[PDB]
Write a protein that binds this ligand. Structure first.
Ligand SMILES: NC(=O)c1ccc[n+]([C@@H]2O[C@H](COP(=O)([O-])OP(=O)(O)OC[C@H]3O[C@@H](n4cnc5c(N)ncnc54)[C@H](OP(=O)(O)O)[C@@H]3O)[C@@H](O)[C@H]2O)c1
Ligand SMILES: NC(=O)c1ccc[n+]([C@@H]2O[C@H](COP(=O)([O-])OP(=O)(O)OC[C@H]3O[C@@H](n4cnc5c(N)ncnc54)[C@H](OP(=O)(O)O)[C@@H]3O)[C@@H](O)[C@H]2O)c1
Ligand SMILES: N[C@@H](Cc1ccc(O)cc1)C(=O)O
Ligand SMILES: N[C@@H](Cc1ccc(O)cc1)C(=O)O
Lengths: 250, 249
């Protein structure tokens, strides 16, 4: 079940995924806006600076690891008629309705589509993926063997496997992940600092701030701009805070 | 071994009593509501009337009533009936208020130790080790009795932090008050675990659950009686507004 995997977008998270893929024995190719030639040499990954050359490589699965905000531009730049054979496309964006809609619209019809979200990354799964959650939606799967072998990348690492529609993911993510990152960035803007008398609860907010601020602002913007349920959750958070505040006035 | 009397035998008074009894101190309690059966079960004497509590043989009185009620509670106590100088300890989650109130209202010859265990039944269910205990020796003349009592927390492995009541309230406004405001906010949102919780969201769900175990009175006291809390609420509100603005454009 060893795969030839091509990563599009070899940034923070693409690198994180590649480390575990290499550990399992997969054969990796990568392409990206920026030049990762030296890092790919270190890791044994075949890097293509040009996406046209990448698309003609011997690849079983293409994994889209670019930012949510850039996905449309990146897919638009792909000469998808250069694809040598029907290929499974996987995305790992943190929102799901958008890539599902875009890939259904832009990809060749005979390319399969697996829309996924590993609910973890470099800050929470440094030391392994065990008992972290991996979400997927089999948007357009006809070659079940290749789809199963890819999904098994996360199952063998002990991930909790969750099959769910892209819409149900975005509904749940707006209420959970988006709220969490919003609070983390709020604490970052406050620049909360440890004191000599931190409660355990506050220590957990300091660490949440620290971990949240490791992610790019692009990523946070994508969580809001491309999740149609995020706006209501932002309102719910503000509405809740003002309800609490007004109890203090009264 | 100390004769310790608890005033306010609620949630946190009961929590402190458990450990104080384990250490071999002799506990008595009094309180607005009746705790006769609970004190029977725990093996300590409950006084329904604060007057009989105050004329007992007692080394330390620990004020474990809500921040909001401290003034009414102290005002109702017939403090001149104390048989001898007695150490008063408060464990309120804010400090400038009890310091100023006790200095004003207590008999001059009673000592005052203002403290804040930075923990409670949710975060220290299984022991006090490496939890922080703040104290300010506001008016100590009997250093032996004060050192005993302080040792209650030291022997449990607490991180012992001496610091002024004002410096406590400045730091607490920035830390505890902010944390509990966020917890209450998540309580009003009624945030719920999903099949795809991130680890960070799991931490917020637990913060919500832990925060909602405390009384609204307690939360209200963190704000009303910490003169530094209002600006920290502003800092939180202003920061969320700034985060929202980065999204709305
Ligand atoms: N814990 C995580 O970070 C995590 C977890 C799960 C899922 N995800 C998702 O994984 C993806 C990558 O996340 P990330 O943490 O690496 O950070 P990110 O800031 O969301 O994305 C960084 C990647 O996006 C590329 N990129 C950004 N703008 C681009 C543009 N105009 N044109 C072409 N490429 C562009 C970058 O390319 P270059 O590096 O070549 O410049 C880089 O590879 C995102 O979709 C994210 O939502 C992240
Ligand atoms: N983890 C914690 O909960 C924690 C940790 C550190 C410090 N503290 C501080 O410990 C103290 C007690 O906290 P708590 O958790 O037990 O909850 P709390 O709601 O702040 O206070 C409960 C106590 O206040 C008494 N009380 C409330 N209103 C009263 C009134 N008008 N008149 C007379 N007594 C009144 C209650 O008496 P009855 O029960 O008899 O009705 C009860 O004993 C507070 O000052 C708190 O700030 C709490
Ligand atoms: N990067 C953080 C948080 C995160 C998780 C999932 C995401 O899709 C985005 C961010 C982590 O490693 O856990
Ligand atoms: N009751 C919670 C939070 C708390 C801590 C200290 C306080 O003063 C008040 C509340 C705990 O056990 O930690």
């Amino acid at each position: 079940q060893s795969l030839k995997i091509g990563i599009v977008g070899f940034g923070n998270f693409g690198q994180f995924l590649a480390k575990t893929m290499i550990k399992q024995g997969h054969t990796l190719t990568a392409t990206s806006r920026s030049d990762y030639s030296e890092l790919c040499l270190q890791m044994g990954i075949h890097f293509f600076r040009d996406v046209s050359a990448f698309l003609t490589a011997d690849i079983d699965v293409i994994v889209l690891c670019t930012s949510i905000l850039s996905l449309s531009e990146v897919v638009g730049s792909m000469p998808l008629t250069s694809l040598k054979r029907p290929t499974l496309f996987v995305d790992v964006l943190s929102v799901k309705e958008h890539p599902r809609e875009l890939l259904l619209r832009e990809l060749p019809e005979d390319s399969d589509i697996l829309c996924t979200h590993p609910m973890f990354g470099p800050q929470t799964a440094k030391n392994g993926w065990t008992d972290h959650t991996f979400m997927y939606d089999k948007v357009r799967i006809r070659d079940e063997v290749i789809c199963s072998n890819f999904i098994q990348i996360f199952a063998t690492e002990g991930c909790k496997m969750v099959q769910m529609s892209c819409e149900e993911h975005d509904r749940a993510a707006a209420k959970s992940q988006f709220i969490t990152h919003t609070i983390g960035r709020t604490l970052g803007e406050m620049d909360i600092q440890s004191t000599p008398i931190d409660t355990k609860g506050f220590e957990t907010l300091v660490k949440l701030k620290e971990t949240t601020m490791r992610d790019s602002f692009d990523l946070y913007s994508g969580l809001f701009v491309y999740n149609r349920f995020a706006r209501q959750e932002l309102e719910n958070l503000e509405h809740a805070l003002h309800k609490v505040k007004e109890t203090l006035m009264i």
